[PDB]
């Protein structure tokens, strides 16, 4: 559900596209993954969309229409349903956030630790803006991780931040919990954009699936994107695995049945909740490479999509790509090149990407009108190494004119 075009329409050599295909066949062969879906798109139009290996390992071939667990790839889509909200003046980038979250007026800070290994609280210099909730540089902590050498997420860890009753129980245990830092000193992924999730309930009325479903899933023609995936569509969810690299064994993974995605979740998570598949987040990345729109349907102004898709960082900061970087910004709810070039990254300045911790990943080129969707189930490294291999051949295989 995009049209489709020779790889020459697209300025690309179909021969060194194929080193591509190549590779991905090569990632289920040597069993590093189980199948996956990518779609490469320039100038609106697919220029290669294609599914491999198997859905479950045994099983079934990967069909182009495999739901996947995109995790923290949910991150920029709540960006999206944020700046709606933006667009109707409900906050304001400059706003602190205990204006839409009064609780907040209580939040303190963990200042390293003491005899009895407590860490020590200074209640917060002030609230942070909405636009460091965005950029992940308000302080808040990290929830997936159980590390006394950090007290912040350790005690996110031990409050089961994630794994809360609604959006107003995680908001509630984060406003009573240590930060890891004051707000605008440093980049640190964290559960803000859950806490951006909440705001979304609050400000709009609706819950979050309905709110995201309105305004951007079926304006958009995402058919199957949400925060489960119902008994019908079981039959095309990607299996999730695990495993070492080297070794050709692949391993269901065990993950929390907090990140089970059978039944609707009772505190749906604007950082890593939806599923999704390759052609509704190829419609979303279009949506955002047209500044906004997609075949009529108008969800956000120009303006808007040009002010996401900029560095929001100030000078010095240092970012992450993927939950699962030098010349490397943060805009809202994604992290943008600034200067590719100085990492020798073939992407074009402006490049705006994110990859979800079961080894989704895409970027969006707005100075190469293109954009690429990467869709496998399997934690650790792989992920990443098929992100940056998979920019390595798009970019050789790209014939633009010089000057």
Do not use: C
């Given at each position: 559900a995009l049209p489709k075009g020779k790889p020459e329409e697209g300025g690309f050599s179909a021969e060194r596209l194929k080193r591509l295909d190549d590779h991905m066949q090569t990632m289920v062969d040597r069993g590093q993954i189980a199948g996956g879906v990518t779609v490469l798109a320039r100038h609106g139009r697919v220029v290669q969309a294609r599914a491999f290996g198997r859905r479950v390992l045994g099983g079934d071939p990967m069909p182009m229409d495999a739901i996947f667990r995109i995790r923290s790839e949910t991150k920029p889509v709540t960006g999206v349903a944020m700046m709606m909200l933006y667009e109707q003046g409900?906050?304001?980038?400059?706003?602190?956030?205990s204006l839409h979250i009064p609780e907040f007026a209580n939040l303190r800070v963990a200042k390293g630790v003491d005899e009895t290994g407590q860490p020590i609280l200074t209640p917060v210099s002030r609230s942070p803006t909405m636009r460091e909730l965005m950029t992940h540089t308000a302080g808040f902590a990290y929830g997936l991780a159980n590390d006394p050498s950090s007290p912040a997420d350790q005690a996110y860890y031990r409050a089961e931040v994630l794994q809360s009753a609604s959006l107003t129980d995680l908001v509630q245990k984060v406003s009573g919990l240590p930060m890891?830092?004051?707000?605008?000193?440093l980049w640190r992924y964290s559960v803000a954009a859950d806490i951006q999730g909440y705001i979304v309930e609050k400000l709009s009325g609706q819950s979050l699936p309905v709110f995201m479903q309105e305004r951007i899933f079926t304006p958009l023609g995402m058919k199957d994107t949400a925060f489960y995936v119902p008994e019908e569509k079981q039959a095309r969810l990607a299996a999730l695995y695990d495993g070492d690299?080297?070794?050709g064994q692949l391993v269901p993974a065990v993950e929390g049945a907090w990140r089970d995605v059978s039944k609707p979740p009772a505190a749906p998570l604007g950082g890593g909740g939806l599923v999704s598949t390759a052609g509704d987040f190829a419609r979303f990345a279009q949506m955002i490479l047209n500044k906004g729109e997609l075949d009529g349907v108008r969800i956000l102004k120009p303006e808007t999509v040009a002010l996401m898709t900029q560095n929001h960082l100030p000078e010095g900061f240092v970012v992450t790509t993927n939950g699962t970087a030098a010349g490397m910004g943060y805009g809202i709810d994604m992290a943008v090149a600034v200067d590719p070039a100085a990492s020798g990254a073939p992407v074009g300045p402006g490049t705006v990407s994110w990859g979800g911790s079961a080894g989704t990943w895409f970027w969006i080129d707005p100075a190469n009108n293109l954009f690429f969707v990467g869709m496998i189930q399997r934690l650790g490294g792989v992920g990443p190494g098929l992100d940056a291999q998979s920019r390595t051949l798009v970019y050789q295989a790209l014939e633009r004119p010089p000057m």
């Amino acid at each position: 559900a995009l049209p489709k075009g020779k790889p020459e329409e697209g300025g690309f050599s179909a021969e060194r596209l194929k080193r591509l295909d190549d590779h991905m066949q090569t990632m289920v062969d040597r069993g590093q993954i189980a199948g996956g879906v990518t779609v490469l798109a320039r100038h609106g139009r697919v220029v290669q969309a294609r599914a491999f290996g198997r859905r479950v390992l045994g099983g079934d071939p990967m069909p182009m229409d495999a739901i996947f667990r995109i995790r923290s790839e949910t991150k920029p889509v709540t960006g999206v349903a944020m700046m709606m909200l933006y667009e109707q003046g409900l906050w304001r980038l400059d706003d602190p956030v205990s204006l839409h979250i009064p609780e907040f007026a209580n939040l303190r800070v963990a200042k390293g630790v003491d005899e009895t290994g407590q860490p020590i609280l200074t209640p917060v210099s002030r609230s942070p803006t909405m636009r460091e909730l965005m950029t992940h540089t308000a302080g808040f902590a990290y929830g997936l991780a159980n590390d006394p050498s950090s007290p912040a997420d350790q005690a996110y860890y031990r409050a089961e931040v994630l794994q809360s009753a609604s959006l107003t129980d995680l908001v509630q245990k984060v406003s009573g919990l240590p930060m890891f830092a004051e707000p605008g000193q440093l980049w640190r992924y964290s559960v803000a954009a859950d806490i951006q999730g909440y705001i979304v309930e609050k400000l709009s009325g609706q819950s979050l699936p309905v709110f995201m479903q309105e305004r951007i899933f079926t304006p958009l023609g995402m058919k199957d994107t949400a925060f489960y995936v119902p008994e019908e569509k079981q039959a095309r969810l990607a299996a999730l695995y695990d495993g070492d690299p080297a070794t050709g064994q692949l391993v269901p993974a065990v993950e929390g049945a907090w990140r089970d995605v059978s039944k609707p979740p009772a505190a749906p998570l604007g950082g890593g909740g939806l599923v999704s598949t390759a052609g509704d987040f190829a419609r979303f990345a279009q949506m955002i490479l047209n500044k906004g729109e997609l075949d009529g349907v108008r969800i956000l102004k120009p303006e808007t999509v040009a002010l996401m898709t900029q560095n929001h960082l100030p000078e010095g900061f240092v970012v992450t790509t993927n939950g699962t970087a030098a010349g490397m910004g943060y805009g809202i709810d994604m992290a943008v090149a600034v200067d590719p070039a100085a990492s020798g990254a073939p992407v074009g300045p402006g490049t705006v990407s994110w990859g979800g911790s079961a080894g989704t990943w895409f970027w969006i080129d707005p100075a190469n009108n293109l954009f690429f969707v990467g869709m496998i189930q399997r934690l650790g490294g792989v992920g990443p190494g098929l992100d940056a291999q998979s920019r390595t051949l798009v970019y050789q295989a790209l014939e633009r004119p010089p000057m």
